[PDB]
Amino acid sequence: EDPQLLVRVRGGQLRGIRLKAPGGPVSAFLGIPFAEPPVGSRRFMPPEPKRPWSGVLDATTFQNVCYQYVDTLYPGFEGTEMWNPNRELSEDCLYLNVWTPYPRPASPTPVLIWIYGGGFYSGAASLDVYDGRFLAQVEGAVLVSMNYRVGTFGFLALPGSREAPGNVGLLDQRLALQWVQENIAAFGGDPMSVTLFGESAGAASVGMHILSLPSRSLFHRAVLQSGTPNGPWATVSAGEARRRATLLARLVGCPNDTELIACLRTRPAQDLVDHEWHVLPQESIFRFSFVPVVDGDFLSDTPEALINTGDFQDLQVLVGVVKDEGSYFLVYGVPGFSKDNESLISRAQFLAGVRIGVPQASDLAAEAVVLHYTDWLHPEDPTHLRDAMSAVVGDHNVVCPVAQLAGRLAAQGARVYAYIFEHRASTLTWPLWMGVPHGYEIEFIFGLPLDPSLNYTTEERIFAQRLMKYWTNFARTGDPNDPRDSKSPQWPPYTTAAQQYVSLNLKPLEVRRGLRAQTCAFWNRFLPKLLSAT
Amino acid sequence: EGREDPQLLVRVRGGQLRGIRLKAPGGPVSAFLGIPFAEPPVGSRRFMPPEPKRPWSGVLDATTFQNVCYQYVDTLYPGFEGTEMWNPNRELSEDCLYLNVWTPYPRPASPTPVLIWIYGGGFYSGAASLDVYDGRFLAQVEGAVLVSMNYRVGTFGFLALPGSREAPGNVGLLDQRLALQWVQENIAAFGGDPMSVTLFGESAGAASVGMHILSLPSRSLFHRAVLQSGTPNGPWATVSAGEARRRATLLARLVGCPPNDTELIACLRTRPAQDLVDHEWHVLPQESIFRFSFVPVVDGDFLSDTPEALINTGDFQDLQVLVGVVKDEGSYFLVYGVPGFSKDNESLISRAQFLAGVRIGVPQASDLAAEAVVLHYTDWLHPEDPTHLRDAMSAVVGDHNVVCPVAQLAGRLAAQGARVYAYIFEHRASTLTWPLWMGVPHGYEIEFIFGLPLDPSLNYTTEERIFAQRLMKYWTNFARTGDPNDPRDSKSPQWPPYTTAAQQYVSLNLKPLEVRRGLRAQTCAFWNRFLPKLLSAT
Numbered sequence A: 001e002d003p004q005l006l007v008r009v010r011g012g013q014l015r016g017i018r019l020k021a022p023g024g025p026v027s028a029f030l031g032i033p034f035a036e037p038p039v040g041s042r043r044f045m046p047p048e049p050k051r052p053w054s055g056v057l058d059a060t061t062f063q064n065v066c067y068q069y070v071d072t073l074y075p076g077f078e079g080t081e082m083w084n085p086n087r088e089l090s091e092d093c094l095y096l097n098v099w100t101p102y103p104r105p106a107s108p109t110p111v112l113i114w115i116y117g118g119g120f121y122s123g124a125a126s127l128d129v130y131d132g133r134f135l136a137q138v139e140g141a142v143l144v145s146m147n148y149r150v151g152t153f154g155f156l157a158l159p160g161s162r163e164a165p166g167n168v169g170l171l172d173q174r175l176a177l178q179w180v181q182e183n184i185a186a187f188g189g190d191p192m193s194v195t196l197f198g199e200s201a202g203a204a205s206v207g208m209h210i211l212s213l214p215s216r217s218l219f220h221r222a223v224l225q226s227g228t229p230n231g232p233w234a235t236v237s238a239g240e241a242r243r244r245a246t247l248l249a250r251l252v253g254c255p256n257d258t259e260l261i262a263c264l265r266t267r268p269a270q271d272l273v274d275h276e277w278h279v280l281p282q283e284s285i286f287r288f289s290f291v292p293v294v295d296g297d298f299l300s301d302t303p304e305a306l307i308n309t310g311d312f313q314d315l316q317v318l319v320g321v322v323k324d325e326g327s328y329f330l331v332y333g334v335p336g337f338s339k340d341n342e343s344l345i346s347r348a349q350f351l352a353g354v355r356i357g358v359p360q361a362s363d364l365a366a367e368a369v370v371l372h373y374t375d376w377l378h379p380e381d382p383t384h385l386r387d388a389m390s391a392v393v394g395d396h397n398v399v400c401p402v403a404q405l406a407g408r409l410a411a412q413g414a415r416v417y418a419y420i421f422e423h424r425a426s427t428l429t430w431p432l433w434m435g436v437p438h439g440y441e442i443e444f445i446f447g448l449p450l451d452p453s454l455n456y457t458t459e460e461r462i463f464a465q466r467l468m469k470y471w472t473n474f475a476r477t478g479d480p481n482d483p484r485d486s487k488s489p490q491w492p493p494y495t496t497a498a499q500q501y502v503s504l505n506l507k508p509l510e511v512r513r514g515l516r517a518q519t520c521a522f523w524n525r526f527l528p529k530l531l532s533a534t
Numbered sequence B: 001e002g003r004e005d006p007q008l009l010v011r012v013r014g015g016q017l018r019g020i021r022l023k024a025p026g027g028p029v030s031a032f033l034g035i036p037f038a039e040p041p042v043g044s045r046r047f048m049p050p051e052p053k054r055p056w057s058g059v060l061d062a063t064t065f066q067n068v069c070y071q072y073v074d075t076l077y078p079g080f081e082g083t084e085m086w087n088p089n090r091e092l093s094e095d096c097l098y099l100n101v102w103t104p105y106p107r108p109a110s111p112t113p114v115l116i117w118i119y120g121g122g123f124y125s126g127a128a129s130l131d132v133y134d135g136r137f138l139a140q141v142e143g144a145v146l147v148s149m150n151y152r153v154g155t156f157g158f159l160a161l162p163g164s165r166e167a168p169g170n171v172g173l174l175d176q177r178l179a180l181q182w183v184q185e186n187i188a189a190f191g192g193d194p195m196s197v198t199l200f201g202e203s204a205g206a207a208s209v210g211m212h213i214l215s216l217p218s219r220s221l222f223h224r225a226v227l228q229s230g231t232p233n234g235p236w237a238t239v240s241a242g243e244a245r246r247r248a249t250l251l252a253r254l255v256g257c258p259p260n261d262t263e264l265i266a267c268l269r270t271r272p273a274q275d276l277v278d279h280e281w282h283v284l285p286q287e288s289i290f291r292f293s294f295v296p297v298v299d300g301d302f303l304s305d306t307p308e309a310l311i312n313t314g315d316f317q318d319l320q321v322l323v324g325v326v327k328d329e330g331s332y333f334l335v336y337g338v339p340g341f342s343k344d345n346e347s348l349i350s351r352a353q354f355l356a357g358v359r360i361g362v363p364q365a366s367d368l369a370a371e372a373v374v375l376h377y378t379d380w381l382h383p384e385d386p387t388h389l390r391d392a393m394s395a396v397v398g399d400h401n402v403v404c405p406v407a408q409l410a411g412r413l414a415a416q417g418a419r420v421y422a423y424i425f426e427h428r429a430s431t432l433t434w435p436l437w438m439g440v441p442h443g444y445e446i447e448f449i450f451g452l453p454l455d456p457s458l459n460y461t462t463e464e465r466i467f468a469q470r471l472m473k474y475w476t477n478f479a480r481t482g483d484p485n486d487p488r489d490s491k492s493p494q495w496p497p498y499t500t501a502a503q504q505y506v507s508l509n510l511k512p513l514e515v516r517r518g519l520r521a522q523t524c525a526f527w528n529r530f531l532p533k534l535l536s537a538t
């Protein structure tokens, strides 16, 4: 037996696997249980800590992926199938993974905890793009990633009920954070230097841990990639969550909350998944059925209220967006859009798209969007209309909620760093018009271009090494800049006055000012006044 | 006669005239100033449409400018050329319906295209006798026959009690039409071609030109039009019959006339002209800038419908139009009524002063509409920057009142069969006495079009003299042919017509013509498409 692969955690002994990374070995501990399987009567309930086990638990393989919808739109297509589950679907999925240097760090190492995205309805920590082996091997980081319940299983709520209180998927995340505090030192990780990092729904989850006091004691720094707790999609009211849970219950034949939830608990997991999408109030894109609820408990108030009133003084935050946040969402529900054609749409198709892209918009609000995003020089130009449609979706859902978050955090004492990721992977199978879609920065941050068998360019390998250094320097120090490296140029903190952010592309860092400032003034200041007063 | 200059004796329908041999830089010109075209609109004739001037006996002396129509005289900055150059230069009188004619000397042997000037002054001021409207250069240099008329302004020209016989409104526009009718009948006596008449005007003069395009009885009196920094459409050029009735009724009250329209108008007719002028400004519904009390009324007669309705539905097939704006349309109006603004300081305003200014500059805007303006014109990188706020304030006023109504007009005329040519005048006169922050204010292109830099005693630069000659050629080439371009001179950059597809316009500055696309397109989409919907809804 290898002593480097034998770890005793509070619940007992584990056995990891020595994994080969380009530059040398890594110790991986995959499929560690952090909770009692949330099955049977425990479905929809908060996670309970995993009871101790006898003997040496085998932690050499990834465990089950949480029960979720599987995309079947483009079968065989890498573009969709890379995000699809790579392990068996099961309700028994509350497991975490730990990658550490081989041998085990001599001194306590900063911990990076990954929270995946997938609109709160999908995802797994076992995906190839979330492989912590490069960050551990190259940057000496202790990387942790956990599975958390998604869809009805993680976010169906009957607010005020004891049986289905909502936000349990976030509680699974918090339980994995408590686990890190209690056991990461056994792996050589520093529980006193924990950075959460997530993308999309994962970034929204990270934001929701910033905004929930019982989570705040479990981490020190945060990275929010292409997602935020504020915004049109990350949360729902207690009323809206109650409406959707009641409708799904009706859809599956379930007719008192105790009674309704009990019936929902008798339903096979796939019956619940089969109706998940049928509870959205309007035809929409970038809207998910079961998401965090503003319960007055995990979230004491709405993320908008909490970001405006919170004290973020002793907090360091790295935030950012990709060049084309909304391009993916268009091929899913906007007529005229396809991955297989150049998607040159007509003016009518654009006006129709704005209603789907901004489903909460009134006739007047949708017109304000249309008149803002039209190029009044070429108002009928199909390329402009196609790109404007991508921008509406990306700006509304990601860029302007990010701009609002960075602004409020900066104004309220946080130390904020903002970026725009503009590099399209050479390997990308989505059409060129989609540009840099949501999530296609992750493989660079994780350092996948370092594996020579993955067919990335040399430029991309050097670029991945750069991003790995920004992220791990941020985790170590709260600053993504290299203290050893003089002349960079430096990455300035984002401030309300200077609104500085940098561009992450193949060229050296470029400092820019104002994150889509005029456009986000429209979304963040004007449009709310349009949907409020009228 | 007998010893008189034989070139200065001309007969018209009303009788004989004697003109004057004037000196222009390049040679002599014939001027016939102070020709009467209407019966003096005095006494019982006040507020009534003009009556054609009855014939006179003997030779009428037409060697001097006549009376300026009764109007408000600016006394804001005394001694200041900036304000006093627009002030009346002849006696104020209700007896003011006279016109001026400049022609080459000797008079042309063959019929010459006619240019008819309609001055601005918010429909409350102006005169055709002003130095910047001197037709001597255009007559001498370009061989033009230039006509300019005085038309009633203020209460005298535009007070209306709509539906009444005694004060029907738009009489100031009828004075203009009467002067157009006069040109048709008599211009051939001066060597002018009645079949080639181009109207040209600036600001309220341009709104007037547009209103002649939109009124059928005027359409037979001209062939081409130039609208400089003004349009019939827009927030200030017209008022509803209801609003004109409200203002006339209030003015009556303010001067002692108790509100039957006959009784009210009769009483208004007994009031000294200065009493009416003293209260003119007190009838505006809100604290505002770029809003005038007595302006054309949508009467269902001169204007069959609103200028917006008429520009959207009209057939402009056989029409050639030259339209344009100056670099800083709104800068003047800020020193007038926006707190924080002065001609004597750099006018760096605060955010609060900007929000306050938007309410004065867009007086019809609701709380939500004013916020849409504020959020559009703010630079969200430097939202507190006083220079940006100052310039944004000028832009709101200029865009709202001139640039976007012009963009709207050019678009609708172009879409409905007209040949449109658009420009942006960007040259600030070297002689200008307004501060540099005001840039190129409203009306400061006029002296270049009229060719004042050609007079060496006026202290303009050589560049400016060459530039004036260029503009005189664009304008007269347009009057002659419906195209501002010189056919002989090809390699010289050309001026493309403005179209809905390409939205092309040119820059008129010291540098050769530069073609630009989209006349403040994103911003004017806001004023012309969005803002009205913010009214139509909340």
Ligand SMILES: C#CCCCCC[n+]1c(-c2ccccc2)c2cc(N)ccc2c2ccc(N)cc21
Pocket (backbone or CB within 6 Å): B278, B281, B282, B284, B285, B286, B287, B288, B289, B336, B337
């Ligand atoms: C209420 C109202 C209208 C405000 C805008 C008009 C400003 N204005 C006035 C004036 C000032 C206060 C209340 C009402 C009117 C004015 C009042 C008098 N007595 C004489 C001249 C002017 C005046 C002259 C020119 C100009 N552009 C605005 C003016």
Ligand SMILES: [N-]=[N+]=NCCNc1c2c(nc3ccccc13)CCCC2
Pocket (backbone or CB within 6 Å): A079, A080, A083, A117, A118, A119, A122, A123, A199, A200, A328, A437, A438, A439, A440
């Ligand atoms: N929303 N939803 N996303 C599910 C679709 N799968 C994809 C995901 C991400 N990016 C994608 C980009 C293109 C296509 C599918 C994608 C980011 C991480 C979450 C999952």
Ligand SMILES: [N-]=[N+]=NCCNc1c2c(nc3ccccc13)CCCC2
Pocket (backbone or CB within 6 Å): B074, B082, B083, B086, B119, B120, B121, B122, B125, B126, B202, B203, B332, B441, B442, B443, B444
């Ligand atoms: N409107 N009104 N303005 C009264 C002041 N007179 C001026 C005029 C014009 N420009 C001016 C520019 C600055 C100051 C007064 C001006 C355009 C021609 C009509 C009159």
